[PDB]
Amino acid sequence: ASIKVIGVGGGGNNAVNRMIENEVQGVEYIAVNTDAQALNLSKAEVKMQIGAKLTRGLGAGANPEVGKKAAEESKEQIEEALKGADMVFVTAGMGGGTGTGAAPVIAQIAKDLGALTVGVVTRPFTFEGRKRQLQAAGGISAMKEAVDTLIVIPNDRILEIVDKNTPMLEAFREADNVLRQGVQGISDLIATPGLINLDFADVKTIMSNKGSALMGIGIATGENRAAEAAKKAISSPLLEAAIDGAQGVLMNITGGTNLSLYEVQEAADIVASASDQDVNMIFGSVINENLKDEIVVTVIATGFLENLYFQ
Amino acid sequence: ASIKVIGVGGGGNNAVNRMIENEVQGVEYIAVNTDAQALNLSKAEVKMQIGAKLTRGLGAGANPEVGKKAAEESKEQIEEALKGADMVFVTAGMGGGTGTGAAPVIAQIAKDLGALTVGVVTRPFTFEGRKRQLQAAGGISAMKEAVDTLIVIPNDRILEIVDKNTPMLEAFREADNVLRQGVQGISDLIATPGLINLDFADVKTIMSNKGSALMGIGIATGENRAAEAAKKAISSPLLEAAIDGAQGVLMNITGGTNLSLYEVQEAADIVASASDQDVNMIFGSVINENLKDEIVVTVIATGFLENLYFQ
Ligand code: NA
Ligand code: NA
Numbered sequence: 046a047s048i049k050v051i052g053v054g055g056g057g058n059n060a061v062n063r064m065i066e067n068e069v070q071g072v073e074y075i076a077v078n079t080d081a082q083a084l085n086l087s088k089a090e091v092k093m094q095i096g097a098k099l100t101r102g103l104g105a106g107a108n109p110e111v112g113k114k115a116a117e118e119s120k121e122q123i124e125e126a127l128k129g130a131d132m133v134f135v136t137a138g139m140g141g142g143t144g145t146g147a148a149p150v151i152a153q154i155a156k157d158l159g160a161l162t163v164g165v166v167t168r169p170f171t172f173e174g175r176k177r178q179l180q181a182a183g184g185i186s187a188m189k190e191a192v193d194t195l196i197v198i199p200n201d202r203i204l205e206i207v208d209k210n211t212p213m214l215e216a217f218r219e220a221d222n223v224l225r226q227g228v229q230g231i232s233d234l235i236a237t238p239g240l241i242n243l244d245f246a247d248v249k250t251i252m253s254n255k256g257s258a259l260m261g262i263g264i265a266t267g268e269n270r271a272a273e274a275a276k277k278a279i280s281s282p283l284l285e286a287a288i289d290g291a292q293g294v295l296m297n298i299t300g301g302t303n304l305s306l307y308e309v310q311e312a313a314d315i316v317a318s319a320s321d322q323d324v325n326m327i328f329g330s331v332i333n334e335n336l337k338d339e340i341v342v343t344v345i346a347t348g349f350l351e352n353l354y355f356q
Numbered sequence: 357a358s359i360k361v362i363g364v365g366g367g368g369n370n371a372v373n374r375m376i377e378n379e380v381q382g383v384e385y386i387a388v389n390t391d392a393q394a395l396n397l398s399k400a401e402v403k404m405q406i407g408a409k410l411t412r413g414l415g416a417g418a419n420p421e422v423g424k425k426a427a428e429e430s431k432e433q434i435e436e437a438l439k440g441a442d443m444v445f446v447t448a449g450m451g452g453g454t455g456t457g458a459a460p461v462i463a464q465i466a467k468d469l470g471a472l473t474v475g476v477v478t479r480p481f482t483f484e485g486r487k488r489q490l491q492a493a494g495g496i497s498a499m500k501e502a503v504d505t506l507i508v509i510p511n512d513r514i515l516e517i518v519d520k521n522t523p524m525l526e527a528f529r530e531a532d533n534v535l536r537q538g539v540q541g542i543s544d545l546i547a548t549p550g551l552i553n554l555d556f557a558d559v560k561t562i563m564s565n566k567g568s569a570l571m572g573i574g575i576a577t578g579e580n581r582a583a584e585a586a587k588k589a590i591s592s593p594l595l596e597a598a599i600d601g602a603q604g605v606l607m608n609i610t611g612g613t614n615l616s617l618y619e620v621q622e623a624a625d626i627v628a629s630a631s632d633q634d635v636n637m638i639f640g641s642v643i644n645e646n647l648k649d650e651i652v653v654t655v656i657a658t659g660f661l662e663n664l665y666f667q
Contacts, residue, residue, distance in 0.1 A: 182664035
């Protein structure tokens, strides 16, 4: 019901701006940062500088311990901002100071206020280096303890989706779009008009597994678009483990006014077929009138036990 | 000081028997099973049938939920057996009913009595099938929540170490020997006479990280045996992640009376060199007079964040 999306650090702030630009419905936005200049580029109504005394508005120096202390020092302000939320999406890039350190604090605060708490985070590109990778892993570990479900987006896999000539700036931009998709894929089903909506209880079920979660996105146009987009979503490089490993599955199929119930069910069947016979699966559909013939299928698959996929 | 090794199910019971056969010092042995016939093959002084009413001595039917309930029903008996332990090694194969379900209960009991609680478990061979793999992953997940450190031994990697003509029976036997090595590698350093012993506090440090732990074993003979065994241990297929990912490292070098302090330090240097500059590393050495020219180096590396190594 009351849904808040809280963007923590640069990548999270970008995901929040993308949602606002795209007029995503039914949610309140909160932008959090230690970097006051980055925060002043936010489009969010609620802009929350944390660590003012500690960081002086200059960011966390890529130190997760500073992001953490900043969040701890602004605990009261965060609690007030999230008060009464039924669901909170805590969205952040991992590997820096602010996202890595503050997001897990914010997540535990959201849990403590009684919110269904969903983390949506990116693992940094390998090109960012080993220190970024290691810090990110620390953050992902803390986030996993602090949320109900943690959706982890591997940025390296984005480089498998986009053109090989994609510039680095656009690669980051695409990462932040995938973050936005991880949030909107779920929130739209609860908040926005479609052929099939889900209530909080429905979502709440699959979003309360242990392990971690992954997402896949598929886009298609043309007569066989529903089957094609559904297969693309489950075959997505973002979905690093096959969906038959998942304990729960949510499917969102979004399209224009020419998307039919038959297409929704056909896509759902394909996803169900690739899943465990005992999966808990839910699905919905929403209409975006700016789509003509394009449809977008987002699968969120939860309950992957990390130990099963250890290299 | 008071060290207990508790073998839970068939694989754990085998590891316990191997230690007893090899006269491992300084530890008390407890064998646990739901299968009364398997338990009557134990050499352990304390033999603990669990789930007598529930399973009638016939085992858990490969159902982890039955192993769990059996352990829960014998909680009092387990608490009495472990009472006062300073350290408890909970050793089990994962993927069956008894090991998978009972070991995590036993581990949390050991934690609740104030023991430093180390899990040493095997992941089943792939040839055992998908159901075994999935059950095992569930168990590893529960064990990780219930111990201070969880050492995970991938049985498939044993097939990379042994002869390609090794029969299946001997493959299982080798798995259970690696389990024993995971326990004795640590316990011998606290309990058994050597060039260099470690006290509880020393171990306790590296055994209290988060994430999971891995082990590597190296064996060599001849003039350059110490350097060779140390390099073999850190290059071991059992050590599925490179040791520079670890937060803590223990090295045990064991040999006959011809093993020198120089050799111990040389091996320790090689291990330290391959580790993170900021690793917490400890090492010791013990003498086994039945070794002539052979030495054995065991590395236990703790604090691997599982998310970092997700496929
Ligand atoms: Na950041
Ligand atoms: Na068993």
